[PDB]
A paper describes a structure:
The R823G mutant complex primarily maintained a well‐folded tetrameric assembly, but its DNA‐binding and MTase activities were hampered. To better understand the defects elicited by the R823G mutation, we co‐crystallized the DNMT3BΔ570(R823G)‐3L complex with 24‐bp DNA and S‐adenosylhomocysteine (SAH). Two cofactor SAH molecules were bound in the DNMT3B homodimer as expected, at the identical cofactor binding site as observed in the previously reported crystal structures of DNMT3B‐3L complexes (Cho et al., 2023; Lin et al., 2020). However, despite multiple cycles of protein structure refinement, we could not observe an electron density for the DNA molecule, indicating that the DNA molecule was either not present or was disordered in the crystals. The arginine‐to‐glycine substitution at residue 823 was confirmed by the absence of the side‐chain density in the Fourier omit maps of both protomers. However, the mutation of Arg823 to glycine abolished the hydrogen bond between Arg823 and Gln827, altering the side‐chain orientation of Gln827 and weakening its hydrogen bonding with Thr775 (the hydrogen bond distance increased from 3.9 to 4.2 Å). Upon comparison with the DNA‐bound DNMT3BΔ570‐3L complex, the hydrogen bond between Arg823 and Gln827 is lost in the R823G mutant structure, resulting in altering the side‐chain orientation of Gln827 and weakening its hydrogen bonding with Thr775 (the hydrogen bond distance increased from 3.4 to 4.2 Å) and Lys777 (the hydrogen bond distance increased from 2.6 to 3.2 Å). Lys777 is involved in making van der Waals interactions with the flanking guanine downstream of the CpG site in the WT structure (Lin et al., 2020), implying that the R823G mutation may affect the flanking sequence preference of DNMT3B. The TRD loop (residues 772–789) in the WT DNMT3B is partially disordered from residues 781–786, but becomes less disordered in the R823G mutant from 784 to 786. On the other hand, the catalytic loop (residues 648–662) responsible for flipping out the cytosine at the DNA minor groove is well ordered in the WT DNMT3B, but becomes disordered between 655 to 658 in the R823G mutant for unknown reason.
Numbering used by the authors:
A (entry chain D), B (entry chain A): 570 to 654, 659 to 783, 787 to 853
C (entry chain C): 178 to 312, 318 to 330, 336 to 350, 360 to 379
D (entry chain B): 178 to 313, 318 to 329, 337 to 352, 358 to 379
Amino acid sequence: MRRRPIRVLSLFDGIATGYLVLKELGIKVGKYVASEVCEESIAVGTVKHEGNIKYVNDVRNITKKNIEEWGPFDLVIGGSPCNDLPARKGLYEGTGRLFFEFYHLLNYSRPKEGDDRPFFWMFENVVAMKVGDKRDISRFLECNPVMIDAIKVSAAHRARYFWGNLPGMNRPVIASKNDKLELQDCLEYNRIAKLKKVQTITTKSNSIKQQLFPVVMNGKEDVLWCTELERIFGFPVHYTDVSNMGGGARQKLLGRSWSVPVIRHLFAPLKDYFACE
Amino acid sequence: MRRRPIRVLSLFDGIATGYLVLKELGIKVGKYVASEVCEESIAVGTVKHEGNIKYVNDVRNITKKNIEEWGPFDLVIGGSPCNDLPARKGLYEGTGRLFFEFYHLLNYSRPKEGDDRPFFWMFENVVAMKVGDKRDISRFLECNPVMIDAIKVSAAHRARYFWGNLPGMNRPVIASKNDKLELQDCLEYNRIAKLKKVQTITTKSNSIKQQLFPVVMNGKEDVLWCTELERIFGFPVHYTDVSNMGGGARQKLLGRSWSVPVIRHLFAPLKDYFACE
Amino acid sequence: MFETVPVWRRQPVRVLSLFEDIKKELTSLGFLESGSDPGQLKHVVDVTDTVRKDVEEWGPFDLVYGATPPLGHTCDRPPSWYLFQFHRLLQYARPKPGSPRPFFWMFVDNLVLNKEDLDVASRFLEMEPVTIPDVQNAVRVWSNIPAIALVSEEELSLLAQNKPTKLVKNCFLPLREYFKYFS
Amino acid sequence: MFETVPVWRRQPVRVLSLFEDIKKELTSLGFLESGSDPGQLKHVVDVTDTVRKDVEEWGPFDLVYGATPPLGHTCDRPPSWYLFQFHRLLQYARPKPGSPRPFFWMFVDNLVLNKEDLDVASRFLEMEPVTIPDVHQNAVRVWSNIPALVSEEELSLLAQNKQSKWPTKLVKNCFLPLREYFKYFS
Ligand SMILES: Nc1ncnc2c1ncn2[C@@H]1O[C@H](CSCC[C@H](N)C(=O)O)[C@@H](O)[C@H]1O
Ligand SMILES: Nc1ncnc2c1ncn2[C@@H]1O[C@H](CSCC[C@H](N)C(=O)O)[C@@H](O)[C@H]1O
């Protein structure tokens, strides 16, 4: 009948990239339940979104009744940790086994056979991954992933796998007029980009230098800045200027975050199913 | 008859509080020569003002011919280091002896007799100071200081002495509609202020806790944040979000900075002597 | 909780045995019949590439059984893989909500799961396990079958340091009220 | 830089001597006379509360002199205080730009200023000093606008030794080119 605000369950929410993308698309968000452990990430989300996010702490403490009463959910998104997918413990040991939890809760949030209401879901992981692990993930999600690289809409390499049932996940990725496509577009004043794109930025500080420092300032080599990484990933400037965090902590948060333009591309079809502004 | 943009020489410029105040007042700035040696402060000024600040380096390398060439100057402002004004070396040893440099350069920038063109100057120092040092400073500047506390316009105690010939330096300080007068107005979301005003914030981190931590978040004690200190001092938020600086470096920069509303109070009469937007 | 069915309406049970086989072990109680080579038990081991349509073509089913490998056999696969694949194929095998009929599942563990694995299994199977001892061997069981003594945990802990369908068939007893009793 | 004045037009010089007095020392060259009520020399040691109108009330001056205390004198004041106060009172004593008259200044140091103090003094006085030595040992440094070979290690070790008074003998001859500008008493 009438479009209603979207209700979202986000697992491994990080710095609330999903809520930010949904709000920037103009979609009304009726409820955003986020499962997240890192206190700095929760602080970022809380401050930047003014308490519109209901945080529920660890994903493994979410119960079936929790999914029943917090719900119903229109969207179920998830982004498992990728530090185990050299001491890697694979999909089944360490923190890779968290993926199944997502799967678990996903089946708890699905509507029944008689319920034909709109319900969308998405799961993100890294491409660098055992082919057997990708096989098992495709098995448990009963579908195959799309591979999207942020380089077509951002100034950095970030190839990620996305499983889900969103409309047009395989449609071609085209850049927008506002997408800062080159590193120079993401730099502060008086700073020059050595390259046009930067290699995949992880949590460690060894992924900035390309290992040649990416920036030149006053003729001296220099690494990237927090606001520069924020522009690279598509976040608003000072999005992680929270909780007295230095360059290291904000880089840790942004190095595992989602590329905002990629999530925008994936969530754009949702505007034809829920209330907008 | 028609005014022109103001030309400013700022000694010990810091994070360019003077330029920020002059721009916020709407005064057209034709030249802003800043002497400053801290690379973080220079970076803050450069990025936040897009290179409009001609940065010179050590104040003691400025020559008489430098004052002649970079000049003429309409405003000469200065803010000497106050770490030597327990191991204090006074006004004549350590960094306190930098004050005279200001004095020196001030008399280089003063117009000659008969050159009745408008020329204003100002020098700031801390009240905590040997009365002999205050006496000698009043001697060298040939005038007496007005004491202004930032608590009447900001949410913090900051009593400072101001020498100068600016119009109305002794007039009463009245707050504005936008002055965040209490600590609660300066905090981020989901954070509660224990007090309404905070004690004098220095560069060290032991001046935040009042030693009771000033903020409560989620029922836990917490220190102030970088954006919170920025709001306390009257700077725009993220003004020091530069150069991968953490909480410590930004607090060091803001703890010796000027109170923006105080400098606005002192610089407001300048709108009737120079061009405005 | 299911109602009990009159004895004349009881049917030959269909079972899905994952990993471990209990074919003749289940005939020993009368649920299967000897002679039917196209019988009522489907046995699979490499479930890595089995899709929901595979389970649907092998069905319908009335019991889904999964078991960890025997303790002492060095596992080529991680212990949690069995639990996760059991859960997957079980959800593949559950009847649709618009056709409620007697349906049971059971996952047994031969003390191959540690504490975190036990917690994961209890979260996914929505119940705490039940231990069965032997005076020495023991098993853990999660099941929706209504079961009919007292042992502490350190016994099992030190027994695992040392280096089994006997304890399992007793759990299959309350199923007799739902299916045929051959032999 | 000034032009030399004809001898019949030369005047009795007026000097401002701070910290160290050269009154009886400057009479020896003829710039002062014994029978003078004002004395033409104004001497003052504690200049902490000296205002500009004080220097102005003390009559116009033609020479301003300041000196550091002798080396064998424990400084109660920091060594740079003398330099800064000399600069202040000198700027107080300069004639207005609308009256270009002969005017000279002189600051002398008895090796009480270290290297950073030397650089500060050379920055404020807009010139490098000149060293006057004493053979058989003392020495002085001089900054002055009067148009009047030893390495530094000698002075360094000499200053370290000479701790355990003020030599006007070395500064006296610097006042000689001032004779072409003021009266020369018998
Ligand atoms: N057991 C757990 N329960 C809930 N969240 C967890 C978790 N283990 C890790 N996480 C969180 O999951 C995040 C995965 S990084 C991905 C963040 C998010 N997809 C984004 O785009 O920003 C990490 O930041 C971590 O804090
Ligand atoms: N010798 C020197 N030459 C130039 N700048 C100096 C200096 N010694 C110290 N400074 C700078 O002077 C600053 C004084 S703190 C005052 C900063 C400024 N008044 C403000 O309101 O922001 C310090 O940040 C220091 O970096």
